[PDB]
Amino acid sequence: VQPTPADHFTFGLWTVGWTGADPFGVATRANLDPVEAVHKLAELGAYGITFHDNDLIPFDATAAEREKILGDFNQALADTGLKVPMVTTNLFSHPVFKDGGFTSNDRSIRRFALAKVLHNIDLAAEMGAETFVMWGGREGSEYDGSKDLAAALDRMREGVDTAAGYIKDKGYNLRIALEPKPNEPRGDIFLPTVGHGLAFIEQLEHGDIVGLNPETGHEQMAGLNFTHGIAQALWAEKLFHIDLNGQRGIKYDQDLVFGHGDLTSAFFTVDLLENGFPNGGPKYTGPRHFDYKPSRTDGYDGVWDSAKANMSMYLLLKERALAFRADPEVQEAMKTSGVFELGETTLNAGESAADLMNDSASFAGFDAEAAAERNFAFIRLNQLAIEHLLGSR
Amino acid sequence: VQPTPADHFTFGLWTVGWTGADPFGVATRANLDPVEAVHKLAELGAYGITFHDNDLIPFDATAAEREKILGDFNQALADTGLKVPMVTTNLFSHPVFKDGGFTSNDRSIRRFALAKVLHNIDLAAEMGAETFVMWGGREGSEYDGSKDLAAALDRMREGVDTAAGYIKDKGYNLRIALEPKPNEPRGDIFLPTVGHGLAFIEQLEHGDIVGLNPETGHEQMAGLNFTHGIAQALWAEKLFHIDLNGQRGIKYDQDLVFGHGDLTSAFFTVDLLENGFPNGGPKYTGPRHFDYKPSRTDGYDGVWDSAKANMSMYLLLKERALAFRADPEVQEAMKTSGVFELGETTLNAGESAADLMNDSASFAGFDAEAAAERNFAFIRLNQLAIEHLLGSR
Amino acid sequence: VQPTPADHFTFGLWTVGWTGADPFGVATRANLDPVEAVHKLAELGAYGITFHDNDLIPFDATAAEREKILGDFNQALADTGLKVPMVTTNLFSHPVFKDGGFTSNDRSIRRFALAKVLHNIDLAAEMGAETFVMWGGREGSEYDGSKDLAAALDRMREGVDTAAGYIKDKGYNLRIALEPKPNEPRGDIFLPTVGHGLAFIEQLEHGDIVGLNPETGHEQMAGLNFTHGIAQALWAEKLFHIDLNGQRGIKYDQDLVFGHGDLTSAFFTVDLLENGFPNGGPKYTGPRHFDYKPSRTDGYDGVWDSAKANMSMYLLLKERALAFRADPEVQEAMKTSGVFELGETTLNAGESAADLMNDSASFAGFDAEAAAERNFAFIRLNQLAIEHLLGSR
Amino acid sequence: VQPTPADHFTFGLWTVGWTGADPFGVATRANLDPVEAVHKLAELGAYGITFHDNDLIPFDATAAEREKILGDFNQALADTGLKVPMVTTNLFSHPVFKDGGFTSNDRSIRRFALAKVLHNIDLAAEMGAETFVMWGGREGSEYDGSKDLAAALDRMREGVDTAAGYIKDKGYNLRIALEPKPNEPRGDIFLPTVGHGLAFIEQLEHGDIVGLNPETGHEQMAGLNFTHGIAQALWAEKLFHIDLNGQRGIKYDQDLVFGHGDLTSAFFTVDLLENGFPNGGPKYTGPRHFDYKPSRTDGYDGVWDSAKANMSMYLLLKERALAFRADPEVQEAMKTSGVFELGETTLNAGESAADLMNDSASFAGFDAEAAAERNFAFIRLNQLAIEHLLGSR
Ligand SMILES: OC[C@@H](O)[C@@H](O)[C@H](O)[C@@H](O)CO
Ligand SMILES: OC[C@@H](O)[C@@H](O)[C@H](O)[C@@H](O)CO
Ligand SMILES: OC[C@@H](O)[C@@H](O)[C@H](O)[C@@H](O)CO
Ligand SMILES: OC[C@@H](O)[C@@H](O)[C@H](O)[C@@H](O)CO
Ligand SMILES: [Mg+2]
Ligand SMILES: [Mg+2]
Ligand SMILES: [Mg+2]
Ligand SMILES: [Mg+2]
DSSP states (O other), X not given: OOOOGGGOEEEEHHHHHOOOOBTTBOXXXXXXXXXXXXXXXXXXXOOEEEEEHHHHSOTTOOHHHHHHHHHHHHHHHHHHOOBOOEEEOOOSSSGGGBTBSTTOSSHHHHHHHHHHHHHHHHHHHHTTOSEEEEOOXXXXXXXXXXXXXXXXXXXXXXXXXXXXXXXXHHTOOOEEEEOXXXXXXXXXXXXXXXXXXXXXXXXXXXXXXEEEOOBHHHHHXXXXXXXXXXXXXXXXXXXXXXXXXXXXSSSSOOOBOTTXXXXXXXXXXXXXXXXXXXXXXXXXXXXXXXXXXXXXXXXXXXXXXXXXXXXXXXXXXXXXHHHHHHOHHHHXXXXXXXXXXXXXXXXXXXXXXXXXXXXXXXXXXXXXXXXTTOOOOHHHHHHHHHHHHTTOO | OOOOGGGOEEEEHHHHHOOOOBTTBOOSSOOOOHHHHHXXXXXXXXXXXXXXXXXXXXXXXXXXXXXXXXXXXXXHHHHHOOBOOEEEOOOSSSXXXXXXXXXXXXXXXXXXXHHXXXXXXXXXXXXXXXXXXXXXXXXXXXXXXXXXXXXXXXXXXXXXXXXXXXXXXXXXXOEEEEOOXXXXXXXXXXXXXXXXXXXXXXXXXXXXXXXXXXXXXXXXXXXXXXXXXXXXXXXXTOBOOOEEOBOOSSSSOOOBOTTSSOHHHHHHHHHHHHHOOTTOOOOOOSOEEXXXXXXXXXXXXXXXXXXXXXXXXXXXXXXXXXXXXXXXXXXXXXXXXXXXXXXXXXXXXXXXXXXXXXXXXXXXXXXXXXXXXXXXXXXXXXXXXXXXXXXXX | OOOXXXXXXXXXXXXXXXXXXXXXXXXXXXXXXXXXXXXXXXXHTXXXXXXXXXXXXXXXXOHHHHHHHHHHHHHHHHHHTOBOOEEEOOOSSSGGGBTBSTTOSSHHHHHHHHHHHHHHHHHHHHHTOSEEEEOOTTOEESSGGGSOHHHHHHHHHHHHHHHHHHHHHHTOOOEEEEOOOSSSSSSEESSOSHHHXXXXXXXXXXXXXXXXXXXXXXXXXXXXXXXXXXXXXXXXXXXXXXXXXXXXXSSSOOOBOTTSXXXXXXXXXXXXXHHOOTTOOOOOOSOEEEOOOOOTTSOHHHHHHHHHHHHHHHHHHHHHHHHHHHOHHHHHHHHHTXXXXXXXXXXXXXXXXXXXXXXXXXXXXXXXXXXXXXOOOHHHHHHHHHHHHTTOO | OOOOGGGOEEEEHHHHTOOOOBTTBOOSSOOOOHHHHHHHHHHHTOOEEEEEHHHHSOTTOOHHHHHHHHHHHHHHHHHHTOBOOEEEOOOSSSGGGBTBSTTOSSHHHHHHHHHHHHHHHHHHHHHTOSEEEEOOTTOEESSGGGSOHHHHHHHHHHHHHHHHHHHHHHTOOOEEEXXXXXXXXXXXESSOSHHHHHHHHTTOSSGGGEEEOOBHHHHHTTTOXXXXXXXXXXXXXOBOOOXXXXXXXXXXXXXXXXXXXXXXXXXXXXXXXXXXXXXXXXXXXXXXXXXXXXXXXXXXXXXXXXXXXXXXXXXHHHHHHHHHXXXXXXXXXXXXXXXXXXXXXXXXXXXXXXXXXXXXXXXXXXXXXXXXXXXXXHHHHHHHHHHHHTTOO
16 A cells, blocks of 8 residues: 555645644654755645644744745745645743633634734635634633633634635635634533534534534444444535544543554544545545654654555555445345435425324334334345454455 | 522423432322422422422322312412412323424324313413523434434424414413433434524524523433523523533433532533623523422432532522622733623724725734734633632632 | 354343333333243353342242242253353342342341342252352442441441352352442442442452442443453453443443444453453453343344344454464564563662662653653554454454 | 641652643743752741752753752752652653653663662661652553553563662662553553552562552542542552642542642542541651642742642641541441441451351341431531531531
């Protein structure tokens, strides 16, 4: 398995650039030059790179510094052919953002935050990015009386609709992707799961250009099924981008390599991304982005190894998932279990509620004890998927 | 503290009627006669009672049996004055519902399930209920390949829109409330949290009459903040009903008495229900329903005690929450922390995006290190709330 | 892969015999006759069967009836050659055990529970079991003030030490194994994890014949690493029996087939049971017992599919774990990462604390910054294990 | 409630001194001078201060510098009267400890870590500390094949037994206390809970002077009951020190003020530390140490507010826990529920196992169905505790 640019594997500058500081220790690695990151990733087979404004341009950068850095990074992009499909803003590291950007209780800070986003849209637009991600990491609270929860959602909405109105006004070819996270760094974060992000988009004035950017480990930090959550996003046609990594349980966000967390869930996520729904429906078509962090125990050989492991894991899972659905035994097990039967509408063509209540066969004369005898054989279908994942089939 | 019918405390027949069987043991209590439940609850100060069709009418009940039971229960209601504000359907106990009702993979079963709901709407309508709850407990999977996830949401939608169309057609004065749960009895349940239920309603043809019925312990089984979740439901004007109980962590659904789980979260939920949002906004106005189970260790004296503890807990929390917001020290702490400041729009009246980017004060000349110096004093506001909850203030 | 009796796969009568009642529904399958259970297990290649006293003999059975049941049961064992390696007692289903067996607050229930246990030991010895398991499923509380926590531990010890002295007194060749569970059916169970069970055994008077029976899903309900937990039990030489199954996360105990939960963790569990430790040490040589439940959506074909599947999964993982450790690339990866280096003592033969203190190259003269540059290459090592797991290496 | 030195409230230098860097941001507060820390703690009523070697003396400090820092530090202690009851070592921040101190895969890091510890013991003794705490924060792994799990336990034991023999050899009046943590910063930490720490101590050669230092938030990260866990440590008489703080659920370690996490559990923790066990037994008489971090959104006023708040919370709970146990209605509720009955031995003085077996009224003649009717009244008992907690009784 060898990734080619046709695979659409994208990486953030902050992933291979993550230096290693965590809550109990300092960096274990020297900073990564952005020019090097770009060359290195292009040599491994990446398709693109993504960044936060401050990953590249320091917060306090003078104008001359910004131009230099941008000339160096654009040179690197020209030399290697990497695309920049997504750009995001850092509204969480500077001390000013301690209570949030968009939903900070201080209004002057909310204004700076939105100003900082608006300027970043311009940059995003000039880099040719198709997606603009918003991860509101500091949007939340540690304590329940810190916020007016209705006002917090109004403030979030104001910021997101202002950013979207500006895109439309400027004619930029960008969509906004919101990225949910249940906690960390705040005790509770606003719009904690895929459902909460999707719900919120529906209250927006400009929701047509707003969708989601779900991350594997974020959903698993609430103990949810990542595959079920991205399936709901898909079904509502709101799956704009995806962040792939691994997580080993409900705890701090590990950011492991994709497939290095819950393996069977990783298998079924790849199947959904590659094979789509068994009865048909929308398919996800954007980048396969890896938002992970190389363990701080490992030196730079490990960094490149970890980048490579992401693409290898995905390609290996993909091979198994295509083999799995192509197997005739699996197709037969699917039919037996009623997977295709779920796709037939419950009612008949032009059958109303009144018509159904009235059908004796469906209710009054329905044999419930006889229907309950069906062996759905879900265990057997599960055994067949796992044997295909282990390559023994 | 003494609950009066003016408090609007409602109880399901299945809560005080829960006999005690769990996964590792049989019932520890004799069945409860429905007539007795009604009299007993009216003597404690309940306002109303709620039930599942099969809580009252056995699954296999003949016509003569159904009429008898309904005559007995309506007599009881007439004698005591209890209301029946909510009615729900049991789509989870019979073996026929092993793969779901609405999203069972077997189509004949989906038809029976919907037929069973339609008939129950009639009953609900005749009892004078304002709310019809749907809890899809068997809607989900243990294994990721058991379902076509897009088809499962189509099947759910078909059932919910059919039920809603029927309400409209019949002219019934009922709204449907969907009730999320992340897991148990299925490994993963569809529409696992408040966000997922709200998202789903937006894809519905008849979503205008569809809202939510969140339960305290269900949200806490995913480790979410119950108060933040009901605040999002409120803000979207979808909080139709509420299920109150207690939960002590991420584990099986305990169904403890309300306030017998996370106490501080219970305190802030009561504040939200009674005081509303600090800057104003919608207020929840329906029943305060308790969906709990009297621990199986306790005899019938304990059952009535537990029913009474629910209303006492709520009334005690309410007293403290009204005291808390009326305290001048708390009002001052709120202002200091920026709780009211969150309520001011970020932009000025007729200030566009372009106008803001352009304001030098907001961005280019903004002093970020100086803004970051504000002491938000959230800890102190948290200390004041807890001292009010402990009654030491 | 075809299991054979030399593989030492054992199954509980209650696993395949679980009819499907859960907290929200009744059984979906007919009761399984235990003579049939024995014949079917033996045809599939199991080596032995285990049971709870009340799995085979009803709680109400007369002596005549107990003799009758046991003669047919022993006949079936004789007909097939299945061993009975472990016997256990049901101290959780009858309403009498609602506050516990050994730690019930009621003294007369404690005496009844201990007498039930002692009689069961006599049957255990009579069947040729080498192990007597104790799962204190109802030992615990929902509420913190329900028990004196020190008296509960004194009553647990009295119960286990009386049973242990009785084995010793009668000279049975039996060992007691305690089985920890964090919760379910109690809100909090005493001795919730492997560590608590191990610690508790060291306070017993007859500790020498008391060890543990860890269960995969139980440590995963506290988000613990099952391989790390059983490693600690093995290190202490207290791993007397093991229960294998699957769990997808912190939620109710699912009891899925082994390998249908956390797959990568199942791989490393199999590596420790089969291969042991990289530098050498203890090895577990007991039976490989499956304590799971066939999903309620499936009929009896699914029941035997599911029993087969446990054995398949273990042999597939066993195979990939042998290939993995045998691989020269893996052995060199382990060497680079310092796996064998951890096996060397920190101190030199005869070096004292004073000596080390005083050795300037280990402290005063140590180059901590040089030492920190080591690439441990843990990411690469993990990528090698998963490629062996996925059958690509 | 005003704390006074007799209350024995102790604080770590790193608690009030935590500047706010978390995984997604930099410090929000200026470094706290430790002489100032001492003066401020003493003004608020603390009894003592604790510190990690590198909290006071930089890792790079010259001997001259170490002497300088220590003279001002000892002067401040002398000026104020604060004791130094516990001392600990930092074996986690420097990049050298990226794979652990005692269990690092690198042998030369293991020697450096042990020498760092031994020197620190000398300082501990010199300061008059009675307790030396060991938190093995980096002892663990992200991946299961990174370590030989048996060698890791041998290296942990070598390290703790060398330090213990050195105390014994020098005759210091010091005890070692191990502090368990399930995860963070390692994906899995060795000795993850109270039970694992207790079990581990029983395999040490110098076990007699080794006990535990449980931390509220750490057991709550595995969803365990902190009162049950510390009850087991106390029962074994291994509760040598305690770390008090708050945690809202299974997620990253929050380190909130004691009482700002699970309030009801904090109430029962305070009851066990202050009141002990209902039937009598061991009591914890050590210092009440606060291991928390002031939230990063707050300035230094919030820092001293937060330190005050820990002491307020403990005295408010202490007060309500004394009122609770003193209450004659509670004492009768406890009596009904069998709390004192659990304190009676199961067996009669001189009754053997044979005797009990053979006592027909405890088994053959037992009315199990009669016995099961007992109302244990646990719900009522819990309602009484919360009404005392809420200050309504
Ligand atoms: O939890 C961190 C988060 O996942 C971060 O890497 C976001 O993805 C980024 O801020 C937006 O792309
Ligand atoms: O988890 C069980 C669920 O909470 C049940 O009691 C629903 O609320 C009821 O089916 C609808 O009202
Ligand atoms: O949670 C159920 C438990 O795992 C049970 O099946 C014990 O293993 C059995 O009682 C002892 O063998
Ligand atoms: O998770 C941090 C840990 O709780 C730490 O502050 C230890 O308590 C300290 O290192 C030993 O005292
Ligand atoms: Mg991300
Ligand atoms: Mg409910
Ligand atoms: Mg078991
Ligand atoms: Mg600590």
